[PDB]
């Protein structure tokens, strides 16, 4: 029987979070650090993210705005730099690892002057301001939250969207079940599990897309656009 929830795989919630914080504290503040040695795929990723996002920026009644985005688990700001700052007037970043947010000030360069808030906080402890963001971007971090905390964080994100705003989750997906990585202290969930959590947060899918052109050996990656 596959496991269907984090409650079947996490021995100790406090250790699940503390071990992950210790893991990221020892990763270099570089794109290759953010991407687990796959820094070279960054451009494939950003190009696909941009095309996925631009779906929602078309003129019409539901056009997503371009005033402010939130980059969740932003790290040094790879996505903030290459995807979000060029499209949004301001961007906020949230990440648990202070040293990454410090490095971001260098990494982002001149355009980083349009980063407004640098929040050093776990997502599980973060309440974004109501009615603040056009796009909330959550990439390669949801596996660091328990199911309960991910559901709650998505509920708080829903409350922080502007009119026509969206949440985007982009992450690894397991073929089946819920799989623990005890080295970095994270989980990989199958598409049914992720969809269950999104539904439980009172969100609906606008779109779902598999990332193409990835190395054959890694977990498949999907993007979801939600409101």
């Amino acid at each position: 029987v596959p496991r269907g929830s984090t409650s079947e795989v996490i021995e100790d919630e406090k250790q699940f979070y503390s071990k992950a914080k210790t893991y990221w504290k020892q990763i270099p503040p570089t794109v290759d650090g953010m991407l687990g040695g796959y820094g070279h795929i960054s451009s494939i990723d950003i190009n696909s993210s941009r095309k996925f996002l631009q779906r929602f920026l078309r003129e019409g009644p539901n056009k997503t705005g371009t005033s402010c985005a939130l980059d969740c688990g932003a790290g040094i700001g790879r996505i903030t730099k290459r995807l979000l700052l060029p499209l949004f007037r301001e961007v906020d970043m949230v990440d648990i690892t202070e040293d990454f947010l410090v490095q971001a000030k260098t990494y982002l360069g001149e355009e980083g002057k349009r980063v407004r808030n640098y929040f050093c906080c776990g997502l599980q402890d973060f309440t974004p301001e109501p009615d603040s963001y056009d796009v909330i971007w959550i990439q390669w971090v949801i596996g660091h939250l328990t199911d309960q905390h991910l559901a709650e964080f998505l509920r708080r994100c829903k409350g922080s969207l502007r009119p026509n705003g969206i949440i985007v989750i982009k992450d690894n997906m397991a073929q089946e079940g819920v799989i623990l990585d005890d080295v970095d202290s994270s989980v990989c969930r199958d598409l049914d599990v992720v969809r269950r959590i999104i539904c439980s947060a009172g969100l609906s899918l606008l779109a779902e897309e598999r990332q193409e052109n990835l190395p054959d050996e890694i977990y498949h990656v999907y993007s979801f656009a939600l409101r």
């Binding site: 390669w140 990585d181 990835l214 190395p215 050996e217 977990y219």
Partner: peptide
């Protein structure tokens, strides 16, 4: 992050 299937 991009990760090898365990």
């Amino acid at each position: 992050y991009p990760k090898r299937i365990a």
